[PDB]
Nucleic acid binder design. Structure first.
Length: 297
RNA sequence: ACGGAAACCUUGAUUCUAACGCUACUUCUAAAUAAGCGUUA
Protein backbone atom coordinates (compact mmCIF):
# COMPACT_ATOMS: atom_id res chain seq x y z
CA UNK A 1 0.00 0.00 0.00
CA UNK A 2 3.11 2.18 0.12
CA UNK A 3 5.30 1.60 -2.94
CA UNK A 4 4.93 0.35 -6.52
CA UNK A 5 7.87 -2.09 -6.96
CA UNK A 6 8.73 -2.77 -10.60
CA UNK A 7 10.64 -5.76 -11.92
CA UNK A 8 11.77 -5.58 -15.56
CA UNK A 9 12.33 -9.12 -16.83
CA UNK A 10 13.94 -10.34 -20.00
CA UNK A 11 13.26 -14.11 -19.73
CA UNK A 12 11.19 -15.93 -17.14
CA UNK A 13 9.51 -19.27 -16.48
CA UNK A 14 6.53 -19.39 -14.11
CA UNK A 15 5.47 -23.04 -14.09
CA UNK A 16 1.73 -23.60 -13.77
CA UNK A 17 2.13 -27.31 -13.07
CA UNK A 18 4.55 -28.57 -15.71
CA UNK A 19 8.01 -27.67 -17.01
CA UNK A 20 6.54 -26.86 -20.45
CA UNK A 21 3.96 -24.41 -19.03
CA UNK A 22 4.75 -20.80 -18.18
CA UNK A 23 2.30 -18.12 -17.07
CA UNK A 24 2.62 -14.44 -17.96
CA UNK A 25 2.69 -13.30 -14.33
CA UNK A 26 3.41 -15.02 -11.04
CA UNK A 27 1.48 -15.13 -7.80
CA UNK A 28 2.37 -13.57 -4.46
CA UNK A 29 3.07 -16.88 -2.73
CA UNK A 30 5.94 -17.46 -5.18
CA UNK A 31 7.53 -14.09 -4.44
CA UNK A 32 7.00 -14.53 -0.69
CA UNK A 33 8.72 -17.90 -0.89
CA UNK A 34 11.54 -16.33 -2.91
CA UNK A 35 11.93 -13.67 -0.20
CA UNK A 36 11.95 -16.39 2.48
CA UNK A 37 14.74 -18.28 0.72
CA UNK A 38 16.78 -15.14 0.12
CA UNK A 39 16.34 -14.14 3.78
CA UNK A 40 17.38 -17.56 5.08
CA UNK A 41 20.40 -17.60 2.77
CA UNK A 42 21.22 -14.12 4.12
CA UNK A 43 20.71 -15.32 7.69
CA UNK A 44 18.09 -12.69 8.59
CA UNK A 45 15.14 -15.03 8.32
CA UNK A 46 13.74 -14.21 11.79
CA UNK A 47 13.46 -10.48 11.04
CA UNK A 48 11.49 -11.15 7.84
CA UNK A 49 9.25 -13.60 9.70
CA UNK A 50 8.54 -11.00 12.38
CA UNK A 51 7.80 -8.41 9.67
CA UNK A 52 5.41 -10.82 7.94
CA UNK A 53 3.66 -11.53 11.26
CA UNK A 54 2.70 -7.85 11.42
CA UNK A 55 -0.54 -6.65 9.85
CA UNK A 56 1.29 -3.81 8.07
CA UNK A 57 2.98 -6.21 5.62
CA UNK A 58 0.91 -6.38 2.44
CA UNK A 59 1.78 -8.04 -0.86
CA UNK A 60 -0.01 -8.52 -4.19
CA UNK A 61 0.32 -10.71 -7.26
CA UNK A 62 2.51 -9.35 -10.03
CA UNK A 63 0.62 -7.46 -12.70
CA UNK A 64 1.79 -6.08 -16.09
CA UNK A 65 3.42 -2.62 -16.11
CA UNK A 66 3.54 -0.80 -19.46
CA UNK A 67 3.75 2.98 -18.90
CA UNK A 68 1.24 2.49 -16.08
CA UNK A 69 0.08 -0.11 -13.64
CA UNK A 70 -2.44 -2.78 -14.86
CA UNK A 71 -5.06 -4.56 -12.87
CA UNK A 72 -6.54 -8.05 -13.20
CA UNK A 73 -9.99 -8.26 -14.71
CA UNK A 74 -12.57 -8.21 -11.89
CA UNK A 75 -14.23 -11.62 -12.08
CA UNK A 76 -17.93 -11.25 -11.48
CA UNK A 77 -18.63 -7.88 -13.15
CA UNK A 78 -19.93 -8.52 -16.71
CA UNK A 79 -23.16 -7.20 -15.21
CA UNK A 80 -25.90 -6.15 -17.63
CA UNK A 81 -26.66 -2.99 -15.60
CA UNK A 82 -24.00 -1.21 -17.70
CA UNK A 83 -23.87 -3.58 -20.71
CA UNK A 84 -27.57 -3.50 -21.68
CA UNK A 85 -27.55 -2.99 -25.45
CA UNK A 86 -29.83 -3.53 -28.44
CA UNK A 87 -27.07 -4.92 -30.69
CA UNK A 88 -27.38 -8.28 -32.44
CA UNK A 89 -26.37 -11.58 -30.85
CA UNK A 90 -23.22 -11.81 -33.01
CA UNK A 91 -21.77 -8.63 -31.49
CA UNK A 92 -22.88 -9.69 -27.99
CA UNK A 93 -21.04 -12.99 -28.32
CA UNK A 94 -18.00 -11.24 -29.84
CA UNK A 95 -17.77 -8.80 -26.93
CA UNK A 96 -18.34 -11.65 -24.45
CA UNK A 97 -15.44 -13.58 -25.98
CA UNK A 98 -13.25 -10.46 -25.98
CA UNK A 99 -14.01 -9.79 -22.31
CA UNK A 100 -13.40 -13.45 -21.44
CA UNK A 101 -10.00 -13.34 -23.15
CA UNK A 102 -9.19 -10.09 -21.32
CA UNK A 103 -7.13 -10.58 -18.18
CA UNK A 104 -5.52 -7.20 -17.47
CA UNK A 105 -6.71 -3.60 -17.81
CA UNK A 106 -4.85 -0.31 -17.59
CA UNK A 107 -5.34 1.61 -14.34
CA UNK A 108 -6.63 4.75 -16.08
CA UNK A 109 -9.71 2.95 -17.45
CA UNK A 110 -10.56 0.23 -14.89
CA UNK A 111 -13.76 2.06 -13.96
CA UNK A 112 -14.32 2.50 -17.70
CA UNK A 113 -14.47 -1.29 -17.89
CA UNK A 114 -17.17 -1.09 -15.25
CA UNK A 115 -19.13 1.40 -17.38
CA UNK A 116 -19.79 -1.17 -20.12
CA UNK A 117 -16.76 -0.35 -22.28
CA UNK A 118 -14.96 -3.21 -24.03
CA UNK A 119 -11.15 -3.39 -24.12
CA UNK A 120 -8.70 -5.80 -25.73
CA UNK A 121 -5.50 -7.32 -24.38
CA UNK A 122 -2.17 -5.73 -25.24
CA UNK A 123 1.06 -7.38 -26.36
CA UNK A 124 3.04 -7.95 -23.16
CA UNK A 125 5.06 -11.15 -23.60
CA UNK A 126 5.47 -14.09 -25.95
CA UNK A 127 5.40 -17.57 -24.43
CA UNK A 128 7.61 -19.92 -26.41
CA UNK A 129 8.93 -23.41 -25.78
CA UNK A 130 12.55 -24.55 -26.17
CA UNK A 131 13.68 -28.16 -26.44
CA UNK A 132 16.83 -29.29 -24.60
CA UNK A 133 18.56 -32.64 -24.27
CA UNK A 134 21.19 -34.44 -22.24
CA UNK A 135 24.09 -35.71 -24.44
CA UNK A 136 25.01 -38.65 -22.24
CA UNK A 137 21.71 -40.49 -21.93
CA UNK A 138 20.00 -40.34 -25.31
CA UNK A 139 16.40 -40.42 -24.01
CA UNK A 140 15.79 -37.09 -22.23
CA UNK A 141 14.40 -34.41 -24.54
CA UNK A 142 12.67 -31.94 -22.21
CA UNK A 143 10.75 -28.82 -23.19
CA UNK A 144 10.85 -25.58 -21.17
CA UNK A 145 8.37 -22.74 -21.64
CA UNK A 146 9.36 -19.08 -21.28
CA UNK A 147 7.65 -15.69 -20.93
CA UNK A 148 9.90 -13.45 -23.03
CA UNK A 149 8.59 -9.90 -22.52
CA UNK A 150 8.55 -7.10 -25.07
CA UNK A 151 7.63 -3.44 -25.62
CA UNK A 152 9.18 -2.22 -22.32
CA UNK A 153 6.64 -4.29 -20.37
CA UNK A 154 7.54 -5.19 -16.79
CA UNK A 155 5.85 -6.75 -13.79
CA UNK A 156 4.86 -4.77 -10.73
CA UNK A 157 3.77 -5.41 -7.15
CA UNK A 158 2.53 -3.18 -4.33
CA UNK A 159 4.07 -3.52 -0.89
CA UNK A 160 5.13 -1.52 2.15
CA UNK A 161 8.30 0.58 2.04
CA UNK A 162 10.76 -1.33 4.21
CA UNK A 163 14.56 -1.34 4.05
CA UNK A 164 14.59 -5.11 4.62
CA UNK A 165 12.12 -5.59 1.76
CA UNK A 166 14.15 -3.20 -0.42
CA UNK A 167 17.40 -5.10 0.11
CA UNK A 168 15.59 -8.41 -0.29
CA UNK A 169 14.22 -7.23 -3.66
CA UNK A 170 17.73 -6.08 -4.62
CA UNK A 171 19.11 -9.51 -3.84
CA UNK A 172 16.18 -11.09 -5.73
CA UNK A 173 17.06 -9.12 -8.86
CA UNK A 174 20.31 -11.11 -9.22
CA UNK A 175 18.82 -14.45 -8.09
CA UNK A 176 15.92 -14.90 -10.51
CA UNK A 177 12.21 -15.50 -10.00
CA UNK A 178 10.59 -18.86 -10.72
CA UNK A 179 11.56 -21.68 -13.01
CA UNK A 180 15.03 -22.75 -14.10
CA UNK A 181 16.77 -19.76 -12.55
CA UNK A 182 20.25 -21.18 -13.08
CA UNK A 183 19.63 -21.58 -16.80
CA UNK A 184 18.81 -18.09 -18.09
CA UNK A 185 15.31 -17.49 -16.70
CA UNK A 186 13.73 -15.41 -13.96
CA UNK A 187 16.25 -12.58 -13.67
CA UNK A 188 15.07 -8.98 -13.51
CA UNK A 189 16.10 -5.39 -12.82
CA UNK A 190 14.27 -3.62 -9.99
CA UNK A 191 12.95 -0.07 -9.88
CA UNK A 192 11.18 1.74 -7.03
CA UNK A 193 8.35 4.11 -7.98
CA UNK A 194 5.66 6.05 -6.19
CA UNK A 195 2.06 4.88 -6.30
CA UNK A 196 0.02 7.25 -8.54
CA UNK A 197 -2.55 9.48 -6.86
CA UNK A 198 -5.33 7.76 -8.83
CA UNK A 199 -4.33 4.38 -7.38
CA UNK A 200 -3.14 4.85 -3.77
CA UNK A 201 -6.49 6.35 -2.73
CA UNK A 202 -8.14 3.08 -3.86
CA UNK A 203 -5.86 0.51 -2.21
CA UNK A 204 -7.77 -0.40 0.94
CA UNK A 205 -7.85 -3.19 3.49
CA UNK A 206 -10.70 -2.55 5.99
CA UNK A 207 -14.28 -1.57 5.13
CA UNK A 208 -17.57 -3.06 3.96
CA UNK A 209 -18.02 -2.08 0.32
CA UNK A 210 -17.26 -3.84 -2.97
CA UNK A 211 -13.59 -4.87 -2.97
CA UNK A 212 -11.65 -6.56 -5.75
CA UNK A 213 -8.70 -8.59 -4.49
CA UNK A 214 -5.18 -8.16 -5.76
CA UNK A 215 -3.61 -11.22 -4.09
CA UNK A 216 -4.24 -14.95 -4.35
CA UNK A 217 -5.52 -14.88 -0.77
CA UNK A 218 -7.49 -17.47 1.19
CA UNK A 219 -9.60 -15.85 3.93
CA UNK A 220 -9.59 -16.93 7.51
CA UNK A 221 -12.33 -19.35 8.54
CA UNK A 222 -14.15 -16.64 10.52
CA UNK A 223 -15.24 -14.55 7.52
CA UNK A 224 -15.41 -17.05 4.67
CA UNK A 225 -19.21 -16.89 4.84
CA UNK A 226 -19.34 -13.33 3.49
CA UNK A 227 -17.05 -14.40 0.65
CA UNK A 228 -19.37 -17.37 -0.05
CA UNK A 229 -22.73 -15.58 -0.21
CA UNK A 230 -21.81 -12.33 -1.96
CA UNK A 231 -18.40 -13.14 -3.38
CA UNK A 232 -17.34 -13.75 -6.97
CA UNK A 233 -14.07 -15.61 -7.25
CA UNK A 234 -11.94 -18.18 -9.02
CA UNK A 235 -10.26 -21.19 -7.42
CA UNK A 236 -6.53 -21.75 -7.90
CA UNK A 237 -4.44 -24.70 -6.73
CA UNK A 238 -1.05 -24.14 -5.05
CA UNK A 239 0.43 -27.62 -5.14
CA UNK A 240 4.00 -28.58 -5.88
CA UNK A 241 7.17 -29.95 -4.33
CA UNK A 242 8.39 -28.18 -1.20
CA UNK A 243 11.99 -27.05 -1.65
CA UNK A 244 14.11 -28.09 1.32
CA UNK A 245 17.82 -28.10 2.11
CA UNK A 246 17.26 -30.51 5.02
CA UNK A 247 15.81 -33.57 3.22
CA UNK A 248 17.46 -35.60 0.46
CA UNK A 249 14.09 -36.69 -0.95
CA UNK A 250 11.57 -34.25 -2.41
CA UNK A 251 8.24 -34.06 -0.58
CA UNK A 252 5.03 -32.80 -2.18
CA UNK A 253 3.47 -30.04 -0.12
CA UNK A 254 -0.24 -29.99 0.66
CA UNK A 255 -2.44 -28.76 -2.15
CA UNK A 256 -4.17 -25.57 -1.09
CA UNK A 257 -7.02 -23.87 -2.94
CA UNK A 258 -7.03 -20.06 -2.72
CA UNK A 259 -9.05 -17.23 -4.23
CA UNK A 260 -7.61 -15.77 -7.42
CA UNK A 261 -7.27 -12.14 -8.49
CA UNK A 262 -9.18 -10.14 -8.97
CA UNK A 263 -11.96 -11.79 -7.05
CA UNK A 264 -14.70 -9.40 -6.04
CA UNK A 265 -16.28 -9.40 -2.60
CA UNK A 266 -18.57 -7.24 -0.54
CA UNK A 267 -16.21 -6.98 2.43
CA UNK A 268 -12.52 -7.40 3.18
CA UNK A 269 -11.01 -10.27 5.13
CA UNK A 270 -7.75 -11.42 6.72
CA UNK A 271 -5.08 -13.58 5.08
CA UNK A 272 -3.06 -16.53 6.34
CA UNK A 273 0.59 -17.51 6.36
CA UNK A 274 -0.58 -21.09 6.12
CA UNK A 275 1.71 -23.99 6.96
CA UNK A 276 1.53 -26.30 3.94
CA UNK A 277 4.41 -28.47 5.16
CA UNK A 278 4.00 -32.24 5.14
CA UNK A 279 3.86 -34.07 8.46
CA UNK A 280 7.12 -35.04 10.26
CA UNK A 281 8.95 -32.32 8.44
CA UNK A 282 11.72 -30.39 10.23
CA UNK A 283 11.04 -26.79 9.03
CA UNK A 284 7.85 -25.00 7.91
CA UNK A 285 6.55 -24.39 4.37
CA UNK A 286 4.83 -20.99 4.38
CA UNK A 287 2.15 -20.22 1.81
CA UNK A 288 1.29 -16.51 1.69
CA UNK A 289 -2.40 -15.66 1.23
CA UNK A 290 -2.91 -12.07 2.37
CA UNK A 291 -5.07 -9.73 0.28
CA UNK A 292 -4.64 -6.16 -0.85
CA UNK A 293 -7.94 -4.76 -2.06
CA UNK A 294 -9.16 -2.31 -4.70
CA UNK A 295 -12.33 -0.25 -4.24
CA UNK A 296 -14.98 -0.30 -6.94
CA UNK A 297 -17.65 2.25 -7.90
C1' A B 1 10.28 -22.73 2.98
C1' C B 2 9.77 -19.98 -5.60
C1' G B 3 5.25 -26.70 -10.12
C1' G B 4 10.33 -26.38 -7.75
C1' A B 5 15.97 -29.28 -8.06
C1' A B 6 19.34 -31.64 -11.38
C1' A B 7 19.73 -32.04 -17.72
C1' C B 8 24.73 -29.30 -24.19
C1' C B 9 19.53 -30.11 -29.12
C1' U B 10 24.42 -33.46 -28.55
C1' U B 11 27.37 -37.63 -31.20
C1' G B 12 29.33 -39.34 -36.64
C1' A B 13 29.34 -36.97 -42.18
C1' U B 14 35.47 -34.07 -47.59
C1' U B 15 30.32 -29.63 -51.55
C1' C B 16 33.15 -34.69 -53.67
C1' U B 17 33.74 -37.81 -58.64
C1' A B 18 34.66 -36.87 -64.58
C1' A B 19 36.27 -32.86 -68.19
C1' C B 20 43.17 -30.47 -72.76
C1' G B 21 40.64 -22.82 -73.19
C1' C B 22 40.73 -26.50 -77.67
C1' U B 23 39.88 -26.83 -83.73
C1' A B 24 41.51 -23.91 -88.92
C1' C B 25 45.06 -19.59 -90.47
C1' U B 26 52.45 -18.49 -94.79
C1' U B 27 54.06 -11.51 -91.20
C1' C B 28 52.29 -11.93 -96.86
C1' U B 29 52.16 -8.59 -101.62
C1' A B 30 55.37 -5.24 -106.21
C1' A B 31 60.65 -3.04 -105.84
C1' A B 32 68.59 -3.73 -110.22
C1' U B 33 72.18 -0.11 -104.25
C1' A B 34 71.02 2.91 -108.41
C1' A B 35 71.04 8.07 -111.44
C1' G B 36 73.44 12.87 -113.17
C1' C B 37 79.63 14.64 -115.62
C1' G B 38 78.23 20.48 -116.90
C1' U B 39 81.84 24.49 -117.69
C1' U B 40 86.92 25.78 -118.06
C1' A B 41 91.56 24.16 -119.32
Amino acid sequence: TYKLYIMTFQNAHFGSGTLDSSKLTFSADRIFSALVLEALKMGKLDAFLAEANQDKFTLTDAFPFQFGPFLPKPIGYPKHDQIDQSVDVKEVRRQAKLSKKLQFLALENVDDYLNGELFENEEHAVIDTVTKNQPHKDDNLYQVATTRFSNDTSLYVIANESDLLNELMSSLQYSGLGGKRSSGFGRFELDIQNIPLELSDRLTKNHSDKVMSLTTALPVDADLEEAMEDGHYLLTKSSGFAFSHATNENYRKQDLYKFASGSTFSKTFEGQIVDVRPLDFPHAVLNYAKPLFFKLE
